[PDB]
Structures are given as C-alpha cells and as structure tokens.
Design an enzyme around this catalytic site. Structure first.
Site, PDB file in Angstrom:
ATOM      1  N   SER A 158      -2.799   1.060  -2.265  1.00  0.00           N
ATOM      2  CA  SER A 158      -1.523   1.387  -2.891  1.00  0.00           C
ATOM      3  C   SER A 158      -1.293   2.894  -2.930  1.00  0.00           C
ATOM      4  O   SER A 158      -1.081   3.520  -1.886  1.00  0.00           O
ATOM      5  CB  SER A 158      -1.450   0.789  -4.300  1.00  0.00           C
ATOM      6  OG  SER A 158      -0.123   0.811  -4.794  1.00  0.00           O
ATOM      7  N   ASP A 175       3.352  -9.497  -1.130  1.00  0.00           N
ATOM      8  CA  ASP A 175       3.193  -8.398  -2.074  1.00  0.00           C
ATOM      9  C   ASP A 175       4.436  -8.337  -2.954  1.00  0.00           C
ATOM     10  O   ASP A 175       5.511  -7.936  -2.498  1.00  0.00           O
ATOM     11  CB  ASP A 175       2.974  -7.083  -1.328  1.00  0.00           C
ATOM     12  CG  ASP A 175       2.499  -5.961  -2.235  1.00  0.00           C
ATOM     13  OD1 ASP A 175       2.937  -5.899  -3.403  1.00  0.00           O
ATOM     14  OD2 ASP A 175       1.683  -5.136  -1.775  1.00  0.00           O
ATOM     15  N   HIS A 206      -0.770  -8.039  -3.818  1.00  0.00           N
ATOM     16  CA  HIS A 206      -0.841  -6.580  -3.768  1.00  0.00           C
ATOM     17  C   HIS A 206      -2.278  -6.090  -3.898  1.00  0.00           C
ATOM     18  O   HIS A 206      -2.713  -5.203  -3.153  1.00  0.00           O
ATOM     19  CB  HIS A 206       0.033  -5.966  -4.860  1.00  0.00           C
ATOM     20  CG  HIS A 206       0.094  -4.471  -4.808  1.00  0.00           C
ATOM     21  ND1 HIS A 206       0.596  -3.784  -3.723  1.00  0.00           N
ATOM     22  CD2 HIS A 206      -0.293  -3.530  -5.702  1.00  0.00           C
ATOM     23  CE1 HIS A 206       0.520  -2.486  -3.954  1.00  0.00           C
ATOM     24  NE2 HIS A 206      -0.016  -2.304  -5.147  1.00  0.00           N
TER      25      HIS A 206
END
Length: 245
Positions: free
Chosen positions: A90, A189, A219
């Site tokens: 991320s 996601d 995610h």
C-alpha cells in the site's frame, strides 16, 4: 505480539520491506521470512507513529515516514549491502516507487499501491478504526475504549492532506522509474482504486515491467489466502534482477 523493525541476515541480495499506513512490520514479516529462507537479506523499518499508541500517530506525517524509509535504505548501505530491492504494501508500495526514481534500486515491487487519492474524511475513518482496534488489543474494556475514543475524535490528523500530496506527487514521477517493476495488485481491493496498478505498469519507463492480478485476495494481500503464491512470485521476480553487478 509486539511490533518492531526486523532485519533478517542472509546473502548479499538485500530487500527493503515497507509496510502501509496505520500498519506495522508484521504486514511484511512473513514475506521477509520467506525471502530470507531463499537467501535474501531483509530489513523492514517501522514508520514513526506506527506500532505505538494512535495518539502518537496523529503527530506524524509523510515527511517522518519517508525519513524512516530513507534511514532503512541507508542502514542497508552502511551495513555493506549496496544492491537493494524495494517491496512495499500500500503506502509502502508508494514509497517503493518513490525510491525507484530517487536512489539506486535493483527492482521495485509495489503491492496494492494507491495512485488515486482518497478524501481526508475517508482516510480519517480508517484512522479512527485503527485507533479503536489498537486500544482493543491493549486489553482495555469496551467502556474505557469509548471514553478514550471520545477524546481521540477531538484531535484531527492534520497531516492527511500531506499524505494526499505524497500519492499525487509520486504518480506524476512514475515515468522517471527505469528499474524493473513488478506491480502486485489484488483484484478485489475495496480499499483503493485498483486502476492504480494499470497506471504504474503503463507509465513506468522500464524495459522489465510486470503486472499480476491476484483474484482471491483483498487489500491486505500479504495476510490473505494467496500469500504463499505471492511469496513465490516476488521471489522469482527478484531472482531475475541484475545482482552482483
């Protein structure tokens, strides 16, 4: 258990592992353990304000977290590891891309890295959920958590706008990355705009650019069900890099 930076010593092939916003090194620990079992030296710093009470997170911003990323890169260099690849989850993937056009990097693996910004309110809702769960994991009763969250809500996180500017600034410099890039993106996601993976792959200017979608992951791909396949795909990509020289 406790979250801490880790360093797994192996061979001369070094990997810098970067966790995400409101995350910790446990998000990349199983990947670091797998790569170290394959002979890689792995180092994962922990961002300022992470792995500590959430009141300390409110006082930190991207300028602090980026310093932790650079300190981790320089630590590997100062320890004798001049050849470093960057893998991040991320926000860590955003920092991995930023390293790609800032310092010499053998290869980058951004995993579910957002290239689209989210509103401050949406980001702050995640901070509030992270803060509530942290106090839950501290062993506090539900009544004590509600009382602390009531004061927590009165302290907005004034660095969220800077976090938006960071994601937008890296997206404008993706075309300055010439290092090999393995874009990892979970298809389901619900945290980011999955078109970020297409932006990274299409606009990176390297000869060795790769993109793989993971059809059974969310995610938090390093903690989801396909992580063993992710470990092997990341390892097999790192093996193609121009090591030694």
């Amino acid at each position: 258990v406790k979250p801490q930076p880790f360093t797994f010593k192996g061979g001369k092939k070094a990997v810098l592992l970067l966790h995400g916003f409101t995350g910790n090194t446990a998000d990349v620990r199983m990947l670091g353990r797998y790569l170290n079992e394959k002979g890689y030296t792995c180092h994962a710093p922990q961002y300022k304000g992470h792995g500590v009470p959430p009141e300390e997170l409110l006082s930190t911003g991207p300028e602090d977290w980026w310093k932790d990323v650079m300190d981790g890169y320089e630590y590997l260099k100062s320890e004798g590891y001049e050849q470093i690849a960057a893998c991040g989850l991320s926000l860590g993937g955003v920092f991995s891309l930023k390293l790609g056009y800032t310092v010499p990097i053998k290869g980058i693996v951004p995993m579910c890295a957002p290239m689209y910004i989210k509103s401050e309110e949406t980001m702050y809702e995640g901070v509030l959920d992270y803060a509530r769960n942290y106090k839950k994991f501290e062993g506090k009763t539900a009544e004590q958590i509600n009382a602390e969250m009531e004061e927590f809500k009165k302290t907005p996180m004034n660095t969220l706008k800077a976090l938006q500017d960071l994601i937008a600034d890296v997206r404008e410099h993706v075309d300055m990355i010439y290092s090999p890039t393995f874009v990892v993106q979970a298809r389901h996601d619900h945290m980011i705009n999955t078109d970020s993976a297409n932006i990274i792959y299409n606009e990176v200017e390297t000869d060795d650019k790769q993109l793989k979608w993971y059809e059974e992951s969310g995610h938090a791909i390093t903690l989801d069900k396909e992580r063993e396949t992710l470990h092997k795909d990341v390892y097999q990509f790192l093996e193609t890099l121009d090591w030694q020289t």
